[model samples]
Target: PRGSHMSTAKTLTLEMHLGDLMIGELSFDATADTFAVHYTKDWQQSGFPLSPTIPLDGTGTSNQISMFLVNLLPENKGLDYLIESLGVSKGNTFALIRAIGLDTAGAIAFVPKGALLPETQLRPIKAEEVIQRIEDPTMWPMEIWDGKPRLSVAGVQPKLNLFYNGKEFAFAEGTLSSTHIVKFEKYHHLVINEFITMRLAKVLGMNVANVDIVHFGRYKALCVERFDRRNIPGEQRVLRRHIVDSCQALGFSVSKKYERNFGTGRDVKDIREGVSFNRLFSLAAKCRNPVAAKQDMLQWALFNLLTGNADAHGKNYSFFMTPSGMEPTPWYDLVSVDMYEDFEQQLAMAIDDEFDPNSIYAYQLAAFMDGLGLPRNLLISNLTRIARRIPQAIAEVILMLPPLDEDEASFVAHYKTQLLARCERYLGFVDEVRDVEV
Candidate 1:
């Protein structure tokens, strides 16, 4: 009980704080109950008023709480946990520590932290198959660090840095993200959650941006490997970053999603002009092949359904810009938007002109895809595959959150309705694809 005192205190407090974090540039003064945060700007601009009903208190109605968590929770949990854990794992290589709060919460949880925390044996994914374009095969066996084998992976990354065949670059981990956006957004823990989300997504077969989730207990993070950085055989790996936010909103005005929603900045600019809406969804979707694209669509859409995520706006998606801007950017920001509190906002994006909080029917989703010119069979088969894979995804998530107790498990399970609902609604479509009766 008395051992690992500082590490325990820091990691536990960080977990609780990350879970309840809000947006805007943030700073915290830990308290027994409240994890005090000071934002850099108006709370609303940065995702505040957490929930109209919550009144900023934890005791709000379920809807209010849901709304608050839906907006704030994803941002914090997804990104913050990534940075912090990675920092601590550098030396010890991310060995397991009883997840944060597992002791008191009676769940097996793992909240990784800084130098003082215990190491987890779970290794960072090393050189696996780097899924990129096929036309020009990418150099195989690239390394995360300079020395380690292309396949070797390590954790103690003091800071998440990007390299292209060796030249360092900016953009994601550049001054803009770390010093400016992060400090200003106050999305400390959201960074970690994003990292965890990507890590899980990639291992599960979702084409994801190169990412690293480091932990420092006090500060968690979700650092993405800039997809733009690439290594050609002999030539310096060209960095063709495609800042998804800038992808021509397929020639739309509202491409810079927040441009109109929040106002200020060009509403429809090329990704180079500024990060906008087009870069987030359609553009990112453009990265995959027809089959890969169809799979990616269902992957994110199904993820939203299963996790109750509603915030997959045009801004949430992005591509790692390469020099030629040819390839799709690495898929990043795999945040699980919590819709428990914001059922009204429980939508990734408008589909078939339906964006309301009504629970989605799989058949409806398939039909929506059909409306988008997608083959219904494609959507159906992919959804079915992902559904079958749910047990695995859930297991991985659960393994990470061993501290997830019955209450939390039930909370996660609640999303099953949407998950299974789609499979059922689309079962007919799948039958058509397989020409089967079952």
Candidate 2:
């Protein structure tokens, strides 16, 4: 209790220069009483013009904000109903906010919007479309939640990480959101943002983290959830940290965290690979946080396969570090790909020493398994379980929410089973390779 009371919170600003040439200045008010965010902006010039209306209201007493920042908001929160509605095949639709920039793999990029998800069908509609949709009312009541206020972009610009202790916190929780006309892929994007992450975390028996909505306008609000609370530790704190924090703290230079310039986040680079990997696994084994790298990797690989995101690579994987470089960082940025405009492959990083999109041999899976240091039996068992249960995960998510159409629901149900099959078949190849290696 000695150092527990030593915790201090103060108002500070988080500034970031994004890839689209836009600069964001966010402010945070920290105190033992209430740690909240009220962001403002003064970014001179940028591609995505900042909405004039900025700053927002409503704070919380728990880890809502914090967990939201880390994509870990609890499943049964205000937006719980909506998560089921969206019919997310990947995540539960709670993760609505997007880190606008060059790639989905990093914090935020300044490059033009199409850089990440270039596939025409998968591309994010015009910002104005998103803005207009948030403002417009839907034919169905479910799209615009009756009790909750209508959607509007209040234009509250987020300041990145100025919301926490310099070394302890910073992550944004994306929530599920609803719009007038939802696309096939995006329909679930919104859903998974809200609930899928929580369910996945629960699958691993982990604590619920922060999850929030993408608030736009004044009443200029639409269907995004709100979960930003000042109380959570890993989430709400204003630390210059993120998945990149893990990459950099580990001294892994393969990632791109800073916008155009500026080395963002904390922790020294001395923890690179050899030191980083060892330290990370050491902590995982130590805390025995069942959501180990192995499990996370399983989900990660599956996320890509199910969502058609064949682009996960070393750069996409991450784990954070503590003040003394002690424990491993939490798992984050778990996304299925097809984000970039010019991408048409699995991932930039390859499996089995190759980047061929058509490749899914057992040897490659074996190498992947080796990279994870996962127990053969446990890995096989968990995969087999997940494979057998994808249909259940899909069904459970659907039974719990509202917005999904019959086609979407059916698609998710079928897709879940298909993914498990793919994973199993790939593992078969891995077994074959294991024998070859032996």
Candidate 3:
């Protein structure tokens, strides 16, 4: 009864499609507890691998396939809600995908074998209903709508994927894809925190996902425009592009998203078996433009440091998989985690094996850059540039937002002070690093 949701048949196959093109077949062997992917000859000829770790010519092992598949689902509380709603087994990633894998993070859609892909369906959701769900999630859960599970993205935060046709929001069903991701406020001032951080990144001259704080009656939400979707000229339809996060690309389990895979306890802190800066930097070689990609990655790390965002994990960053190679996607989920007193202060991907952001010094950053095969001058220059730009960027971003309530305004004010201090402190440390020999 544990995996009863999955079919009793010895083997179950699902057709994997990228938009209209059927790229491959994902098969689960119940007898062997194995998952396999076989790319079609047509896809092999024209398309890139779903993930770099998953090759085009060969079917990867069950573990590799499982790692990739599991990352596609929601993590933590989101996964819990999805499991309860769907009545699916906790460990059965295959069954989970079978249920809600239609409209996921990227272009890939999983449909049952031999069945034609479903037609595009956009069900209009009224603003009143959205407000009702957001206000009282227990009575009207955000993950479920019309008695169906409507969410499939990662992370613990509550979010809903909907199509925005420049006027109103609609739920995407069947083959129709969502154009924007609406993230609700679970913690205090969470939406405004991300809204400002994302805008600040853009103002600082980095490519970032477009975000807006939208209000549904009294409820506020952060609506992020999907960089993976492209308008088809005059047509209402949008083409979905394929992208994979660092975890999927690097073949690491969800638990290994942070550099220190285990907790920062005495026993496991030294293991350091997860996605580290050294490993992430190594990925630039696979990028279409390795130099630019490396620079982007460096800027991303520095920006997080300046903003005191220690939660910038592997899944937060992603890259588009093209025929040529992978290209970094517009940066997303750029929140300042250090603003919260209860949040962990250690960086997700440590600098030179140093987990503590406060403890990182100029020499350590120089060592970090050296370990990543990056030039010392590059680190000094970008660090100086970003730290100098943050204060002005924060001011510009604050003016862009709608008037905030007392609590929201107070939170932003406190956050600005903390961030400015962090930038100034880091600037001094970078100046110290600048004196180090290349």
Candidate 4:
């Protein structure tokens, strides 16, 4: 079951690993109806919190830690739907990981590391089998280990973690972790859409994960490098970076990732009042370089808006944990859902109390600030600076994009037109900020 918890194993103790060091243990006592996280003596004394809100103390119950797990698993429905198709409940986070822990996001692998299934050579698959797996995942030759397929990366859009041996891709059966995230196509021109958006973000001077577009006959995919794992100096081994998402950082469930989903049915407050940008800014204030980080974050948010990315919610933003503190991870999971005709026009987080895309303006943004009274000039400065780079970044990234088919070409052109229109409208407002009544 994808999210189900019908398991014979009552007690599950997961050891959190970051590179070579053992961070802590997540002990779940299902019979007691509780869970706890206890850091090892050495790990407990380490400065950084597992998450900004989660303390290093030996006590943390499941209620306090479920949100952390939610972000660890995939939030998108595609994989859940796929898992459910195989007769598993996606609701049970524990069971899901038990099946896929071989590959996961960041550098955190669950447990069973000391004892693992013997490593096997990569099974060669022809292009047809790969294509078939995309269509009917049941045909996928994914070897199973005792609760090992459970490892996962957050977000949706069907993906699998795999290793690249400089020649061909391979799968790790037991405790081995994968270095690359291979994303499969779900809808029309998905690979191209994400590739351009990610590259554009990089060109605009934002830290972004690397992506490569691959073609298997008519099918397309995006191979993204995992920023959470990196090689240590000249060593053959790679290390995991300690990172977490805004949902975990703020102690909110991943289900409530969208601001509109914050409360009971019809009882939820307005997006701006409930999931305020003010709260995010408050968290940003704790960063190593709060001032510069906050500005970079603001620019990142603005960049999403200008690009018509309506899904830039809390989970899409992340924090990179350093021995010193948590800074933001490279901007990721960026795609312009506005390109789809049926997509909603509301922004994920409100801007100056405005949620409607058509209502966002330069003056409203300039007035948006943290509870500490962020300067108006800071907002205007980031807006103008990021806004000025859109056209050039779009042009440069699009030029470097791989060749597309006729349908793909038309779709990309529509995306280009929509983006340019948005750029002009937003820039027009900035230019008229002095004239417009605030």
**Once superposed on the true structure, which residue ranges of model 4 sit more than 4 Å away at CA?**
1-11, 76-92, 113-126, 137-151, 165-167, 231-236, 262-276, 370-372, 432-438
lDDT, model 2, position 380: 52
Ranking by lDDT: 3, 4, 1, 2
lDDT of 2 by residue, 1-438 (tens): 333333221113333333323344333334432223332244222122111111123333223333222322111221333344344333321122222221222232222212233332111223344344444425333223323322211111111121222222212222211111111122334334334433443444332233322222221211221221123355322112212322233332322221111121235222222222223343344222544544555655544544445534333344432222223334333333332225465343344444444575655655665765665555456555555555556556445444556764664455455545665665455346445451
**lDDT of each residue in 1-438, candidate 3, tens digit only:** 344454443238888888878899888887899988899898888889879978888568889999999999887466777788768788989889987778777888888865555676788988899988888888988877887777888887888878997678998777778889999988888899999999999999899999999988888899999998875768777789989999988999998998888877878888888888888888889999999999999999999988888899999899999989999999999998888897667899988778888988898888888878778889899989888888889999999888888998999999899999999888777777856653
TM-score of 2: 0.42
Q: Best by lDDT, which number?
A: 3
Per model, state how many residue pairs clash: 78, 85, 0, 21
Candidate No. with top TM-score:
3
State which candidate, 1 or 4, has the greater lDDT: 4
Residue 55, candidate 2: C-alpha displacement in angstroms: 35
Prediction 4 global C-alpha lDDT? 0.69
TM-score ranking, high to low: 3, 4, 1, 2
Model 4 per-residue lDDT tens digits across residues 157-198: 676666654446656444455667778877777788889989
Clashes of 3: 0
What's the TM for model 1? 0.44
